[PDB]
Design a protein around this ligand. Structure first.
Ligand code: DAN
Ligand code: CA
Ligand code: MG
Ligand code: MG
Ligand code: MG
Ligand code: MG
Length: 448
């Protein structure tokens, strides 16, 4: 229609960019200063997940609303097939700090074989990263100095990237397959930040000691974006979607969150904790033993009063939505299934939109609208109060009033952002692991 905008796709990441053969897993965010940040996995040996790859994190920036982009940078790179996989972006509006979090595995490890627990040990009230030698003897890293099990200082030291130095000379890296001292083979959550609008980024901080429980095997970022709560008692809280597996390997979603501008993090309960299934069974994420109730990658949005809605990948074939009245600490026992929205067991993106649409608060959603990773569709969902819960809290539902096919054929992971002009940017996997496409759309197009 006249006035509708849907730009022709640009290959924002593609084979050869930064000398990476493959790319996957988009994240897209507009900063407070109006800059667009796009992050992605630079998958260097094909498209596979860890451990069958060597994956680095890459970022591109646009300072002109997505019309032109910078030459890109690699911001995290571990050696010898240790990978960083699945990024998410969020900014703290109060301080201007941008966070990028990612899952990190040592060489040989990934989702399916991650070991139990955080990989940290408490010694006299502080958590310290553990390292193991070939015989399984345990050492700890205390302010980057390696101590043995008797708390004798050794000749070894580390840095934030896991390099291992003997008397100050680098000999290996605790994340490699060859090191004489190795971190535990499991997932770690890494956080980096930028205070200059994405131009420069910190060394990684390993926050597993704050968020990963002893009974979790995998705990990983759910890729895309986080939120900072705008309304209500938890205004300011930074919320980052994650998901984990228990000792039986079964997946449950949750969020991690920070109330002190990203300095410290907490994991909330899962919607699987005290969840009431359709057959009436009350489950929890620590004991979940069946595949059907699994809840995996997720993204979160906020309702007008601050209530949170967690949109989750799951095994039902349709969208699942959880509700939190306490800022992501816990969730209501009923996970809703929205049979208006197919969910083929793939990541989805959902964001709040800043302007009312047809007199209602709205969200924008993107996923493959099919029983497979295809038919990529962007939707506008209008928020209505439909009633209350028995506890008196408002009960909200979505009306998926506008649904637009944007990508015929292959469509997998994606990430949305609202742009400064009120339009919508979208970075999507329109190929399995090669070209990652960026488009800008206006509401006239999405409604047409
Ligand atoms: C850490 C990791 O492996 N992430 C991968 C994730 C995961 O394998 C699945 O969620 C496990 O159930 O899946 C996929 C996928 O295309 O489906 C891509 C992610 O990069
Ligand atoms: Ca690497
Ligand atoms: Mg463009
Ligand atoms: Mg090496
Ligand atoms: Mg080797
Ligand atoms: Mg609950």
């Amino acid at each position: 229609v006249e006035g509708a905008v849907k730009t022709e796709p640009v290959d924002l990441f593609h084979p050869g960019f930064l000398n990476s053969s493959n790319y996957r897993i988009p994240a897209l965010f507009k900063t407070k200063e109006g800059t667009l940040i796009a992050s992605i996995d630079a998958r260097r040996h094909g498209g596979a997940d860890a451990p069958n790859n060597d994956i680095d994190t890459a970022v591109r920036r646009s300072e002109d609303g997505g019309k032109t982009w910078d030459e890109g940078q690699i911001i995290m790179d571990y050696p010898d097939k240790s990978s960083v996989i699945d990024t998410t972006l969020i900014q703290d509006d109060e301080t201007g700090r941008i966070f990028l979090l990612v899952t990190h595995f040592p060489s040989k490890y990934g989702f399916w074989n991650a070991g139990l627990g955080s990989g940290f040990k408490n010694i006299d009230g502080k958590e310290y990263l553990c390292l193991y030698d070939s015989s399984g003897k345990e050492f700890t890293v205390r302010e980057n100095v390696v101590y043995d099990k008797d708390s004798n200082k050794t000749e070894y030291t580390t840095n934030a990237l896991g390099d291992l130095f003997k008397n100050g000379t680098k000999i290996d890296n605790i994340n490699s397959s060859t090191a004489p001292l190795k971190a535990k083979g499991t997932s770690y959550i890494n956080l980096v930040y930028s205070d200059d609008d994405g131009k420069t980024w910190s060394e990684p901080q390993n926050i597993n000691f704050q968020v990963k429980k002893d009974w979790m095997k995998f705990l990983g970022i759910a890729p895309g974006r986080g939120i900072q709560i705008k309304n209500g008692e938890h205004k300011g809280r930074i919320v980052v979607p994650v998901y984990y597996t228990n000792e039986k390997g079964k997946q449950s979603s949750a969020v991690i969150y920070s109330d002190d501008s990203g300095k410290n993090w907490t994991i909330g309960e899962s919607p699987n904790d005290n969840r009431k299934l359709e057959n009436g069974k009350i489950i929890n994420s620590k004991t979940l033993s069946d595949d059907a109730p699994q809840l995996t990658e997720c993204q979160v949005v906020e309702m007008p009063n601050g209530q949170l809605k967690l949109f989750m990948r799951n095994l039902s074939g349709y969208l699942n939505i959880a509700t939190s009245f306490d800022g992501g600490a816990t969730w209501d026992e009923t996970v809703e299934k929205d049979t208006n929205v197919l969910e083929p067991y793939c990541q989805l993106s959902v964001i709040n939109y800043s302007q009312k649409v047809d007199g209602k608060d709205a969200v924008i959603f993107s996923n493959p609208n099919a029983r497979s990773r295809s038919n990529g569709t962007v939707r506008i969902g209008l928020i209505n109060q439909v009633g209350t819960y028995e506890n008196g809290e408002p009960k909200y539902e979505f009306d998926w009033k506008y649904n637009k096919l944007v990508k015929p054929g292959y469509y997998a992971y994606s990430c949305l952002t609202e742009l400064s002009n009120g339009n919508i940017g979208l970075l999507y996997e329109g190929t399995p692991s090669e070209e990652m496409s960026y488009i800008e759309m206006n509401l006239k197009y999405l409604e047409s």
